[PDB]
C-alpha cells in the first residue's frame, strides 16, 4: 500500500488519465505459496506483452527474488518431493532458469529485470543466492554509509559491479573513465585511514590532490531524481552517458580541480556543476 | 661573526644553529660572553640569565637553570639547558616568596647536605629575583 | 569439527581482531605524541653528541670496567624492539669481557 | 515504520539521541582502554554512557511520553555530561519527580501540543538547568 | 548491522579453549598467585604487629 501511494504521488502511476508507466502485480504474503511462486511469472508475462507485441524495452522489478525461491521450495515440499541441500526445492535451478530465461533480449525488444536479492544468513554460497547470481549481469548495492554521506542515489560505487564493464562492450573511453573513477575512490579510501591517523597535512602533495578529486567525484555521483522533485525542490536530471563520461573524465583530468567540492554535489551535467560554482556566493 | 648558536631545552628549542654576535651565558666559575671565535670551553651552567645578541641587533633574554656551554673550536656553541624559561612566564611575587621562604629554611636545615640543598635553592632564587 | 567449535573459534578471533584494532589506534595516538616531542629531543641530544663529534674522543686501549645501558620499555607487543636491544647487549658483552673489561648492564626496561 | 510512528517531540529528541548513540557504538571498542584517545572520541564515549544509563528503565514501570521526552531532552542536550555515570539514573528519577510535580503544565504542553515548541525548549532548558544545579546534594 | 551475521560475545576467547584462552587463563593465575603471596605476607606482618601490641 505504501509503494502504491508513493508511486501515485511520484507520478509514475496516474489514476486520473492514462499516463501510468508501471503495472503492479502483488503477491502478498497472506496468499498461499503457489500464488507467491507464480506471481513472478504473472508479472513477467505482463512485461512480455510490451516486449513482443509493442516492441518496447520493459523493466520487470521483482522484489526479493529470494521469496520466489522460498515459495518454490514450499510448493515442492507440499508436493512431497524430497528436499535438496539446505532444504530448497530439488528443481531450484530449473525453476530459476525457466523464470529468468524469459527475461532476455528478443528481436522485437528486450526485458531488463532489476531484481532485489535477499541473502539468507549472509551466505552468498547459499543455494538461492548462488542460483540467482548465476543469472545476474550487474549488481547495485545501495549502502547506508553512502546515504550517511548524503550521496543520493546511495549506490556504493566501488562495490557495485557489472558484467558488461569490459572495453569490447562499453567502449574504451567508457571503460577508462569507469576504471579511473574506481581507482580514484579506492586510493582515497585507502589513504582515508592515513589522514585519520597521521593527518591531512601529513599527506603527500598528490595525496592531497587525489582527495580533492575523489571528493569531487563522490559528490558528482549524486544526482537529483525527478520522482522526488516535488519534495526536494530540485528538478531531476537525466544525464546522458556521453555527458557522464565527459564530466567524470574532466574531473579525473583535473580540469575542474579549482572548482569547490560543493559545486559537484547534487548536480546533473558538469556544466550545471560549474554554473553552480559560479552561483555560490 | 657567523657563529652558529644552539640554545635548546628538553621541552622547547630556542635559537638552533643561528649566526649570533654574542651570547652572554650564566656559566659557573664566572660568566663569560660567548664570542664569534671564543676558545673552546666546556663549562657547566649556573642559574641565571642568558642574553643572545643576535647579529640583527636585538638581544633576546632567557633564564637558564643549568647545563653545559659546549662551544667548539669552530663557531658552534651548544647551550643545552635543563630548564630554558623566558623571563615573562616567571612570577615575581612567588619568586620573592620562595627566596624568603628558602632563606628562612636555611636556619632549620640542620644537615650540611640539607643546608647545601637550601643553599642551591637560595642561589637560584637570588638569580631569579634579580631577573624579575 | 562441529558448527559449535567453528563458531567458538570464529567468535574468539573476531574479538581478538577488534581488540587489536583498538590497540592499534591507541598506539597510533601515543606514537603521534612521541614523534612530536622527538623533534625537540633530537637537537638536545645532538648537543650531547657534539662533544665527541668535534672533540673526537676514543677509549685509549682498554677500560678496567664497562657499562652497557640498554634502554627499552616494560610493555611488549612491539615486535623485536626489546629483542634487538637484548641481542646487541649480548653481542657486546661477548665482544667485551674477552679483554678483561668487567661489563655491567643497567636494564632500563 | 520509523519516525512516522513517533510524536514530533519524541522525533526531535530521539533523532539526536540515535545519532549520538550510533557514534558511541562506533567508538565503543576504544572505551575499554580509550583514555588515550582524541577528545572527540572521549566526548562520544561519555555521551554514549550517559545515554545508555538514561535508556535503562525499571521493570513494570511504564513511563509517559512527556516524561520520556523530558529525560531524553536532559540527556541529548548535554546537561548530564558533567554528572557522574552512576548518578545518571538517580538524576533521572529525581528530575522525573520534580518535573511531574512542580512543572506539570510543561508536561501538559508536550502532551497536548505534541511538539517541543521554542518556548517549551526555553522553559525545558530553564527547568533542567535549575534542577541539575540543585540536584547534587 | 545485519542480525544474520555471526555475532561474538564477551568471554569467547576463553570459551574457545584454544591457545589464546589458555594463555589468558595461565596469565591471570600467574599474576594473582604472586599477589596472594604479597597479600599473605602483609597479613602475616599485620598478625605479628598485633601480637607485639
Automatic annotation (TrEMBL), chain A:
Keywords: ATP synthesis, ATP-binding, CF(1), Hydrogen ion transport, Ion transport, Membrane, Metal-binding, Nucleotide-binding, Translocase, Transport
Main location class: membrane
Top-level taxonomic group: Eukaryota
GO CC terms in record: cytoplasm; proton-transporting ATP synthase complex
Keyword Cell inner membrane in annotation: no
Subcellular location(s) per record: Membrane
KW Endoplasmic reticulum (keyword) present: no
Residues at which ADP binds: 152
Binding positions for ATP per the UniProt entry: 163, 166
Residue span, AAA+ ATPase domain: 1-139
Any one GO molecular function term: ATP binding
Record text on subunit structure and interactions: F-type ATPases have 2 components, CF(1) - the catalytic core - and CF(0) - the membrane proton channel. CF(1) and CF(0) have multiple subunits.
Function as written in the Swiss-Prot or TrEMBL entry: Produces ATP from ADP in the presence of a proton gradient across the membrane. Catalytic subunit beta, of the mitochondrial membrane ATP synthase complex (F(1)F(0) ATP synthase or Complex V) that produces ATP from ADP in the presence of a proton gradient across the membrane which is generated by electron transport complexes of the respiratory chain. ATP synthase complex consist of a soluble F(1) head domain - the catalytic core - and a membrane F(1) domain - the membrane proton channel. These two domains are linked by a central stalk rotating inside the F(1) region and a stationary peripheral stalk.
Record family assignment: Belongs to the ATPase alpha/beta chains family.
Protein name: ATP synthase subunit beta
Gene: ATP5F1B
TrEMBL record, chain B:
Predominant location category: mitochondrion
Domain ATP synthase F1 complex delta/epsilon subunit N-terminal: 3-84
Record key words, sorted: Acetylation, ATP synthesis, CF(1), Hydrogen ion transport, Ion transport, Membrane, Mitochondrion, Mitochondrion inner membrane, Transit peptide, Transport
GO CC list: mitochondrial inner membrane; proton-transporting ATP synthase complex
Statement: the UniProt record of this protein carries the keyword Transit peptide: yes
Subcellular location: Mitochondrion inner membrane
Domain F1F0-ATP synthase delta subunit C-terminal: 90-131
Single annotated GO MF: proton-transporting ATP synthase activity, rotational mechanism
Its job: Subunit delta, of the mitochondrial membrane ATP synthase complex (F(1)F(0) ATP synthase or Complex V) that produces ATP from ADP in the presence of a proton gradient across the membrane which is generated by electron transport complexes of the respiratory chain. ATP synthase complex consist of a soluble F(1) head domain - the catalytic core - and a membrane F(1) domain - the membrane proton channel. These two domains are linked by a central stalk rotating inside the F(1) region and a stationary peripheral stalk.
Family under the similarity heading: Belongs to the ATPase epsilon chain family.
The name this protein goes by in its record: ATP synthase F(1) complex subunit delta, mitochondrial
Gene: ATP5F1D
From TrEMBL, chain C:
Keyword Ion transport included in the entry's annotation: yes
Gene that encodes it: ATP5F1C
GO terms of molecular function: proton-transporting ATP synthase activity, rotational mechanism
Role of this protein: Subunit gamma, of the mitochondrial membrane ATP synthase complex (F(1)F(0) ATP synthase or Complex V) that produces ATP from ADP in the presence of a proton gradient across the membrane which is generated by electron transport complexes of the respiratory chain. ATP synthase complex consist of a soluble F(1) head domain - the catalytic core - and a membrane F(1) domain - the membrane proton channel. These two domains are linked by a central stalk rotating inside the F(1) region and a stationary peripheral stalk.
Alphabetical keyword list: Acetylation, ATP synthesis, CF(1), Hydrogen ion transport, Ion transport, Membrane, Mitochondrion, Mitochondrion inner membrane, Phosphoprotein, Transport
Portion of the parent chain present: 2 to 110 of 274
Name of protein: ATP synthase subunit gamma
Recorded superkingdom: Eukaryota
Subcellular location: Mitochondrion inner membrane
Family assignment from sequence similarity: Belongs to the ATPase gamma chain family.
Major subcellular location class: mitochondrion
UniProt GO cellular component terms: mitochondrial inner membrane; proton-transporting ATP synthase complex
Classification of source organism: Eukaryota, Metazoa, Chordata, Craniata, Vertebrata
TrEMBL record, chain D:
Taxonomic source organism: Sus scrofa
Alphabetically ordered keywords of this record: ATP synthesis, ATP-binding, CF(1), Hydrogen ion transport, Ion transport, Membrane, Metal-binding, Nucleotide-binding, Transport
UniProt family annotation: Belongs to the ATPase alpha/beta chains family.
GO cellular component assignments: mitochondrial inner membrane; plasma membrane; proton-transporting ATP synthase complex
Compartmental location: Cell membrane; Mitochondrion inner membrane
Membrane found in the keyword field: yes
Name recorded for this polypeptide: ATP synthase subunit alpha
Superkingdom classification of source: Eukaryota
Residues annotated for ATP binding in this entry: 57-59
GO MF term set: ATP binding; proton-transporting ATP synthase activity, rotational mechanism
Residue ranges occupied by any ATP synthase alpha subunit C-terminal domain in the UniProt entry: 6-131
The protein's role, per its UniProt record: Produces ATP from ADP in the presence of a proton gradient across the membrane.
Amino acid at each position: 500500500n505504501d509503494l502504491y501511494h508513493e508511486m501515485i504521488e511520484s507520478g509514475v502511476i496516474n489514476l486520473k488519465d492514462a499516463t501510468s508507466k508501471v503495472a503492479l502485480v502483488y503477491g502478498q504474503m497472506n496468499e498461499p505459496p503457489g500464488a507467491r511462486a507464480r506471481v513472478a511469472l504473472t508479472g513477467l508475462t505482463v512485461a512480455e506483452y510490451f516486449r513482443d507485441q509493442e516492441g518496447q524495452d520493459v523493466l520487470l522489478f521483482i522484489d526479493n527474488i529470494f521469496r520466489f525461491t522460498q515459495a518454490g521450495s514450499e510448493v515442492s515440499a507440499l508436493l512431497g518431493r524430497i528436499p535438496s541441500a539446505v532444504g530448497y526445492q530439488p528443481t531450484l535451478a530449473t525453476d530459476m532458469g525457466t523464470m529468468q530465461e524469459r527475461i532476455t533480449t528478443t528481436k522485437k525488444g528486450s526485458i531488463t529485470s532489476v531484481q532485489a536479492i535477499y541473502v539468507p544468513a549472509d551466505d552468498l554460497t547459499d543455494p538461492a543466492p548462488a542460483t540467482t547470481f548465476a543469472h545476474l549481469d550487474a549488481t547495485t548495492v545501495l549502502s547506508r554509509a553512502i546515504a550517511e554521506l548524503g550521496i543520493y542515489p546511495a549506490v556504493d560505487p566501488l562495490d557495485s559491479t557489472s558484467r558488461i564493464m569490459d572495453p569490447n562492450i562499453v567502449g574504451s573511453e567508457h571503460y577508462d573513465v569507469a576504471r579511473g573513477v574506481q581507482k580514484i575512490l579506492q586510493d582515497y579510501k585507502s589513504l582515508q585511514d592515513i589522514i585519520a591517523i597521521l593527518g591531512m597535512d601529513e599527506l603527500s602533495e598528490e595525496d592531497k590532490l587525489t582527495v580533492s578529486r575523489a571528493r569531487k567525484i563522490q559528490r558528482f555521483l549524486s544526482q537529483p531524481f525527478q520522482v522526488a522533485e516535488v519534495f526536494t525542490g530540485h528538478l531531476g536530471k537525466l544525464v546522458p552517458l556521453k555527458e557522464t563520461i565527459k564530466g567524470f573524465q574532466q574531473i579525473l583530468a583535473g580540469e575542474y580541480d579549482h572548482l569547490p567540492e560543493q559545486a559537484f554535489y547534487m548536480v546533473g551535467p558538469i556544466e550545471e556543476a560549474v554554473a553552480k560554482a559560479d552561483k555560490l556566493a | 661573526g657567523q657563529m652558529s648558536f644552539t640554545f635548546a631545552s628538553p621541552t622547547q628549542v630556542f635559537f638552533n644553529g643561528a649566526n649570533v654576535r654574542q651570547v652572554d651565558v650564566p656559566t659557573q666559575t664566572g660568566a663569560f660572553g660567548i664570542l664569534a671565535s671564543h676558545v673552546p670551553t666546556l663549562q657547566v651552567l649556573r642559574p641565571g640569565l642568558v642574553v643572545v645578541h643576535a647579529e640583527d641587533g636585538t638581544t633576546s633574554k632567557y633564564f637558564v637553570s643549568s647545563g653545559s656551554v659546549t662551544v667548539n673550536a669552530d663557531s658552534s656553541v651548544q647551550l643545552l639547558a635543563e630548564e630554558a624559561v623566558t623571563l615573562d612566564m616567571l612570577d615575581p611575587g612567588v619568586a620573592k616568596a620562595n627566596l624568603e621562604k628558602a632563606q628562612s629554611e636555611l636556619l632549620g636545615a640542620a644537615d650540611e647536605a640539607s643546608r647545601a640543598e637550601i643553599q642551591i635553592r637560595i642561589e637560584a632564587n637570588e638569580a631569579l629575583v634579580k631577573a624579575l | 569439527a562441529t558448527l559449535k567449535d567453528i563458531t567458538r573459534r570464529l567468535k574468539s578471533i573476531k574479538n581478538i581482531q577488534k581488540i587489536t584494532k583498538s590497540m592499534k589506534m591507541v598506539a597510533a595516538a601515543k606514537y603521534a605524541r612521541a614523534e612530536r616531542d622527538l623533534k625537540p629531543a633530537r637537537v638536545y641530544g645532538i648537543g650531547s653528541l657534539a662533544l665527541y663529534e668535534k672533540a673526537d674522543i676514543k677509549v685509549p686501549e682498554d677500560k678496567k670496567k664497562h657499562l652497557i645501558i640498554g634502554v627499552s620499555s616494560d610493555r611488549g607487543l612491539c615486535g623485536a624492539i626489546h629483542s634487538s636491544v637484548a641481542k646487541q647487549i649480548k653481542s657486546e658483552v661477548a665482544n667485551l669481557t674477552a679483554a678483561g673489561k668487567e661489563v655491567k648492564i643497567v636494564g632500563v626496561g | 515504520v520509523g519516525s512516522a510512528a513517533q510524536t514530533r517531540a519524541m522525533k526531535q529528541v530521539a533523532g539526536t539521541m540515535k545519532l549520538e548513540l550510533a557514534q558511541y557504538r562506533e567508538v565503543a571498542a576504544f572505551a575499554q582502554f580509550g583514555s588515550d584517545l582524541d577528545a572527540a572520541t572521549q566526548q562520544l564515549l561519555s555521551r554514549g554512557v550517559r545515554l545508555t544509563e538514561l535508556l535503562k528503565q525499571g521493570q513494570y514501570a511504564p513511563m509517559a511520553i512527556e516524561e520520556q521526552v523530558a529525560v531524553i531532552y536532559a540527556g541529548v542536550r548535554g546537561y548530564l555530561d558533567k554528572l557522574e555515570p552512576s548518578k545518571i539514573t538517580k538524576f533521572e528519577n529525581a528530575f522525573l519527580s520534580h518535573v511531574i510535580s512542580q512543572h506539570q503544565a510543561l508536561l501538559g504542553k508536550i502532551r497536548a501540543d505534541g511538539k517541543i515548541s521554542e518556548e517549551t525548549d526555553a522553559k525545558l532548558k530553564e527547568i533542567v538547568t535549575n534542577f541539575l544545579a540543585g540536584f547534587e546534594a | 548491522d545485519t542480525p544474520e551475521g555471526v555475532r561474538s560475545g564477551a568471554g569467547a576467547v576463553r570459551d574457545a579453549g584454544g591457545a589464546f584462552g589458555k594463555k589468558e587463563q595461565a596469565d591471570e593465575e600467574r599474576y594473582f598467585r604472586a599477589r596472594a603471596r604479597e597479600q599473605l605476607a602483609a597479613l602475616k606482618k599485620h598478625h605479628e604487629n598485633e601480637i607485639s601490641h
